[PDB]
Design a binder for this molecule. Structure first.
Ligand SMILES: [As]
Ligand SMILES: [As]
Ligand SMILES: [As]
Ligand SMILES: [As]
Lengths: 140, 140
């Protein structure tokens, strides 16, 4: 699929919220533990993502995630569209979080350790972190 | 220079702390407004950075920035070394922040807008965001 398509959803763990972005073409992920599910936090994450990758469109599993004017303003400013109307990651990620959870005091540390492990793991046969960079560089 | 060298420093603005990472070979930046200058926040940012890019070494302008065991543990786990013993960005970035500051309520929004503007600006003649991806993909 197109190199500009992203998936953005939130999951819950230990009473906290984890924001999870997936680059659909590569399987690369970025993730953050956020205070709670707020439009303001979603908007921040979108702006950071867009300043780093060529983000064209973002899909989500919960469309109400994007209804706040803060989110719509971020998407407007960054030139991002949404699709009005991947699972192997959110499973794998929570699996990897589980494996490393006791090795870190704060969930946020375990989450970033798990993202690192996911993006560097070679499946075949590049890693997801290698694929995204190769896909983006190629499209240039 | 080598594609694995990063620069990480903190600057201050409006009573808040901005963490600024620069990919030395490309001029690409990532930045975050953080509560205050804490080892814990530095460690989080390092782990996120490392899960996304092939980070080998990080330089800083304030070596005491890296003395907390939290930071040393993050660097240990991610395989990152520091150099025991770029300015055009921190100037340009605060300049760009200034230009957009009134267009956003929170400094954190202005910071991400400024990072976006910096990484997408074409100097010549790719943008910094294009250069980093091309440098990393090539080194694969
Ligand atoms: As969400
Ligand atoms: As959007
Ligand atoms: As700092
Ligand atoms: As280090």
């Amino acid at each position: 699929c197109s190199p500009g398509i992203w998936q953005l959803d939130c999951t819950h763990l230990e009473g906290k919220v984890i924001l999870v972005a997936v680059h659909v073409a590569s399987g690369y992920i970025e993730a953050e533990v956020i205070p709670a599910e707020t439009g303001q936090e979603t908007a921040y994450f979108l702006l950071k993502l867009a300043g780093r990758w060529p983000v064209k469109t973002v899909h989500t599993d919960n469309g109400s995630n994007f209804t706040s004017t803060t989110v719509k303003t971020a998407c407007w400013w960054a030139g991002i569209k949404q699709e009005f109307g991947i699972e192997s990651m959110n499973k794998e990620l929570k699996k990897i979080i589980g494996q490393v959870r006791d090795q870190a005091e704060h969930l946020q540390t375990a989450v970033q350790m798990a993202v690192f492990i996911h993006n560097k793991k070679r499946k075949g046969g590049y890693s997801a972190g290698e694929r995204i960079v190769d896909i983006i560089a190629t499209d240039i």
